[PDB]
Amino acid sequence: QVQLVQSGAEVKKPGASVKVSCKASGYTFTSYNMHWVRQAPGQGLEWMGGIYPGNGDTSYNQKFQGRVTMTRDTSTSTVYMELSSLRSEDTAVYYCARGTVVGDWYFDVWGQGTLVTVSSASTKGPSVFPLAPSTAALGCLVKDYFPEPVTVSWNSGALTSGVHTFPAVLQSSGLYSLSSVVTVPSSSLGTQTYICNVNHKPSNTKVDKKVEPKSC
Amino acid sequence: DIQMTQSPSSLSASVGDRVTITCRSSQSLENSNGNTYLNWYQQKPGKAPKLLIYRVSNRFSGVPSRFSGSGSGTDFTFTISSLQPEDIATYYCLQLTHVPWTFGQGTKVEITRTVAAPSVFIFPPSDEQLKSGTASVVCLLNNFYPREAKVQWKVDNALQSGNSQESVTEQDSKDSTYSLSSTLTLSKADYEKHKVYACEVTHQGLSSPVTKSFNRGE
Amino acid sequence: GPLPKPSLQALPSSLVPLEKPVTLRCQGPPGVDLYRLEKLSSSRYQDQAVLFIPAMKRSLAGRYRCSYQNGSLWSLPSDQLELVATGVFAKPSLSAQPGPAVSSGGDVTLQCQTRYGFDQFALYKEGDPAPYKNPERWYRASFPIITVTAAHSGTYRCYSFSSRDPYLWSAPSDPLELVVT
Ligand SMILES: [Cl-]
Ligand SMILES: [Cl-]
C-alpha cells in the first residue's frame, strides 16, 4: 500500500509563505528521495528540488534557491516543502514524488497534489442550489466561493455513473461557480433520493443538498 | 538549463492509431559517463502524472506493451502503438541528466470518434436562489462529440450576449465525449420581468438546432 | 475501531543465508493478551509473538504479518515482513561504471549479471534498513545513482533471483566498495 498523502489546499496572501506536507507510507522511507514538482493551472510541470530523507541533504532548482526549504521528519515519514515570498506566479498544484535513492525509475509514486492559491481576496464558502429534474438530468449549482477547490459527491459517493462535475468559472465578482450534474432514469425519480455533498475545506463549509422534482 | 521541446503540443487520433510524440533537448542528454536519464509520464485530467517509460526505452512495471520510447543524444520519441480511449492524457518527457531537471511542455492526446449529438437540458433558478436577489439559468449539453458546439440564450425571443459563462469537461476516458454547462445570470428583477427562457443548441450531430425552454412561474 | 498495528522485525536480518538463524518478532504494547503471527502463503498460523528459525530453509522464505488482541479487540495487522533465504543459487557478478572510486556530483551505475534463467536483482548496502529492488526483468540489470554524494559510499552486494520464487535469492556477489569523494 505505497502512498504519498499531502496536506489540503491553501490560500495565502502575496508576500506570505506556504508549507505543504507529504506523508509517506507502505515503503522504507529512507530508500527514496522526495522531490517536489509544481503545475500552474492549465500549464506544464516544473521541478522544484528534492531531499534525501536519510540525512536531510537537499538540492533545489536555482529558480527557487533562497525561497524554498525542504525538510523531513523521519519519525513520521513526512517531508515538508515551504515556499516563501509568494506571488501570483506561485499559484499552482504542488506535488511530492518519490525517487529511488539507487535507480533511475524516478517519480513512480506521487502525492495527490495540493492547490496553493496566492491572492489577497477573502475566503468565502459556497451557496448550494438544486437543479431539479424537469433519461432525466438533475444537479447542484455551487455558487460564489473562493478559493478553489470544492469537492462534489452524490449520495455520499454511492452514485458516480453519469456524474459530470464541471470545471469552475471565475465570475466578474472574483468568486467561483460550478454545477455538478447527473443523468438518471426518469422512472426512478419517484423512489430514488438524490443528494449532492459539497465540501469547501478552505472555508470549512460542508453542505448536503437534497435535489427533488419541483412539486406542481 | 536544458530546454525540452515537445512536439506536437496536441493531437487527436482514432482508436487503434499509432501516435508518435517527440522531445528534443537543447543540448546533449549523453552525460560524461555515456549515460542518459530521460523518462516519460502520462497525466490524466485531475490526476498526478504516472511513470510509463524510464531510461529512454524501459517500460516501468505494469505498463502495457503499447507504450514505447526510443532515441539518443538530443532526439527522443514516445510511441503509443494502438491508441485506446483510456489513453486520453497529456504526456510529458523529463530529462534527469543535467540539474535542474526539466520537463517538456507536454503533448495533449485526444480521441477522434463518430459524431454524437448532445442531449440538452434546461434548469430554471431555484426559489432558494431567487430569495437572495440573483437568478442563474443552467443549460446542460451532455455527452457529445466533436467539442465544438454553440449555445444561444434567448429571453422572450431576444438574443442574449455578455451575460453567460460556459464550462466544458475533459474528454471522457470511456466514450470519448464532452459535456458542457452554460449558465445565464440575471438579477431577480430582470428575471421576473420576462417569461420565456430558452437555450438553443447548435451542433454537428443535430440536423436542426435543439431548443429547450421554460416559462417563468409554470 | 481496531487497535494500532504492531511492528514485525527480523534479526539479525531479513536476508538470511540457508542454515543460518533468524528471529521474527511481533511487537505490540506491553501486556497484550494474545499475538498471532502468520505467513501469507500458509493456511495456518501461530499464537505467539516470536518465531525462531534455527536454520533457514527455502520453505520458510516468504511474506509474514502479525497482529495482537487486547480486551477482545484485534489490532490492525503489522506491515508485511519479507523474509528471504539467500545462498540458494550461485552468486551474480557486481561491477561499477565508470568505477568504484568516483567524484561527487556525477553518476555511478552499479551493474549485476547472472546466467539466463534469473530475471531479477536486488542490491544491499551494509548498514541500510533494506535492499533495493529493480523493475528490470533480464539476465543483467543496471542500478544508476543519478547524482552520487559522499552518503552513497559503502559496501554493496548484489543478489539475483527469479520471479518464479521471489523470496529465494542467490549467494551475494563479491562486495563492491563504493568510494565517493
Ligand atoms: Cl530477537
Ligand atoms: Cl509468501
Residues paired with residue C16 on neighbouring β-strands, in sequence order: C85
Chain-centre distance for alpha carbon A53: 25
**In this structure, are C115 and C46 located in the same domain?**
no
User: Which chain A residues touch B104 with a CB distance below 8 Å?
Assistant: 44
- Taking CB atoms and an 8 Å limit, are B58 and C136 in contact across chains? yes
CB A129 within 8 A of CB B129: yes
Please name which of C15, C181, C176, C171 lies closest in space to residue C109, comparing C-alpha atoms.
Answer: C176
The answer as to whether A216 is a domain residue is no
Which domain, by its residues, includes A170? Answer: 127-211
**Which residue in the set B43, B49, B123 is minimally distant from A132, CB to CB?**
B123
Is there a common fold for B4-112 and B119-215?
yes
Same domain, C174 and C150: yes
Residues A102 and A134 in one domain: no
C159, C121 contact by CB (below 8 A): yes
Which of C66, C86, C106 is the last residue in one of the domains? C86
- Resolution in Å equals 1.9
Residues C17 and C74 occupy one common structural domain: yes
Q: How far is CA A192 from CA A157, A182, A187, A188, A215, in A?
A: 15, 13, 9, 6, 16
Asked whether residue A104 falls in the same domain as residue A195, the answer is no
Answer for the pair A145, A170: CB distance below 8 angstroms, yes or no.
no
With contacts defined as CB-CB under 8 Å, which chain A residues touch B44?
none
Nearest CA to CA, how far is B124 from chain A (Å)?
8
Contacts of C55 (CB under 8 A, 6+ apart): C18, C19, C20, C21
If asked whether residues A71 and A108 sit together in one domain, one would say yes
> Does any domain span residue C37?
yes
Q: Do B167 and A169 touch (CB under 8 A)?
A: yes
- What's the rounded Cα separation, in Å, for the pair C109 and C148? 10
* Same domain (yes/no): C176, C101: yes
What would the DSSP string read from start to end of C4-45? PPPEEEEES-SEEETT--EEEEEE-STT-SEEEEEETT-S-E
Q: What is the CATH number of the domain that holds A113?
A: 2.60.40.10
Grid cell locating C5: 498495528
A13, burial (CB in 10 Å: exposed 0-12, middle 13-18, buried 19+): exposed
Residue A85 C-alpha from the chain's centroid: 22
> How do beta strands B10-14 and B107-112 pair?
parallel
Q: Are residues C100 and C169 in the same domain?
A: yes
Interface residues on A facing C, Cβ-Cβ cutoff 8 A:
26, 28, 30-31, 52, 54-55, 57, 59, 100-106
A153 and A101: one domain? no
Domain region containing C147: 93-180
In a domain, C165, yes or no: yes
Chains contacting A (3+ CB pairs below 8 angstroms)? B, C
Experimental approach: X-ray
Distance C85 CA to ligand 1 centre (A): 18
DSSP at B129: H
Q: Are residues A11 and A95 in the same domain?
A: yes
From C58, C86, C114, give the residue that closes a domain.
C86
Residue C88: left if φ>0, alpha if ψ -120 to 50, beta else—which one? alpha
Single out the residue in A63, A84, A118 at which a domain terminates.
A118
A101: which chain C residues are within 8 Å (Cβ-Cβ)?
Answer: 132, 145, 152
Q: What is the CATH number of domain B119-215?
A: 2.60.40.10
CATH (domain of C98): 2.60.40.10
Q: What is the 3-state secondary structure of chain A?
A: CCEEEECCCEEECCCCCEEEEEEEECCCHHHEEEEEEEECCCCCEEEEEEECCCCCCEEECCCCCCCEEEEEEHHHCEEEEEECCCCHHHCEEEEEEEEECCECCCCCCECCCEEEEECCCCCECCEEEEECCCCEEEEEEEEEEECCCCEEEEHHHCECCCEEECCCEECCCCCEEEEEEEEECHHHCCCCCCEEEEEEHHHCEEEEEECCCCCC
Q: Which CATH architecture has domain B4-112?
A: Sandwich (2.60)
Helix (H, G, I), strand (E, B), or coil: what is residue B188? Answer: helix
Report the residue of chain B nearest C142, measured CA to CA: B55
Which residue type, as a one-letter code, is found at position B134?
T
**How many separate domains does chain C show?**
2
Residues of C in contact with B61 (CB under 8 A): 135
Interface mutation vs chain C, best among B35, B38, B94, most C CBs within 10 Å: B35
C-alpha to C-alpha distance for A91 and A107, rounded to whole angstroms: 22
User: Nearest 10 degrees: CA dihedral of B29, B33, B34, B39?
Assistant: -50
All partners of chain C with 3 or more CB pairs under 8 angstroms = A, B
- A136 and A193 in a single domain? The answer is yes
Residue A108 sits in the same domain as residue A59 = yes
Q: H or E stretch including B22?
A: strand B19-25
Distance C84 CA to ligand 2 centre (A): 10
- C-alpha of residue C175 to centroid of ligand 2, in Å: 28
Cα(C123) to centroid of ligand 2, in Å?
A: 20
Q: Are residues A157 and A199 in the same domain?
A: yes
B101 touches C at CB < 8 Å: no
What is the count of structural domains for chain A? 2
C-alpha cell at C15: 536476508
Determine, yes or no, domain membership for C1. no
Contact of B210 with chain A, judged by CB distance below 8 Å, is answered with: no
Q: Where are the domains of chain B?
A: 4-112, 119-215
Same domain? A103 vs A135: no
Calculate the alpha carbon distances from B75 to A151, A173, B28, B30, B96 in Å. Answer: 42, 47, 9, 11, 15
Contact check, Cβ <8 Å, B35/C135 = no
Q: Which of A89, A118, A147 lies at the terminal end of a domain, its last residue?
A: A118
Q: Kindly list the distances between the CA atom of residue C99 and the CA atoms of C106, C109, C112, in Å, as whole numbers in the listed order.
A: 12, 8, 14
CB of A143 less than 8 A from some CB of B? yes
d(CA C102, CA B201): 68
Rounded CA gap, A162 and A49, in Å? 40
> Cell numbers at residue B28, please?
546533449
Based on the fold, state whether residues A12 and A99 are members of the same structural domain. yes
DSSP notation for C37-74: EEETT-S-EESSSEEEESS--GGG-EEEEEEEEETTEE
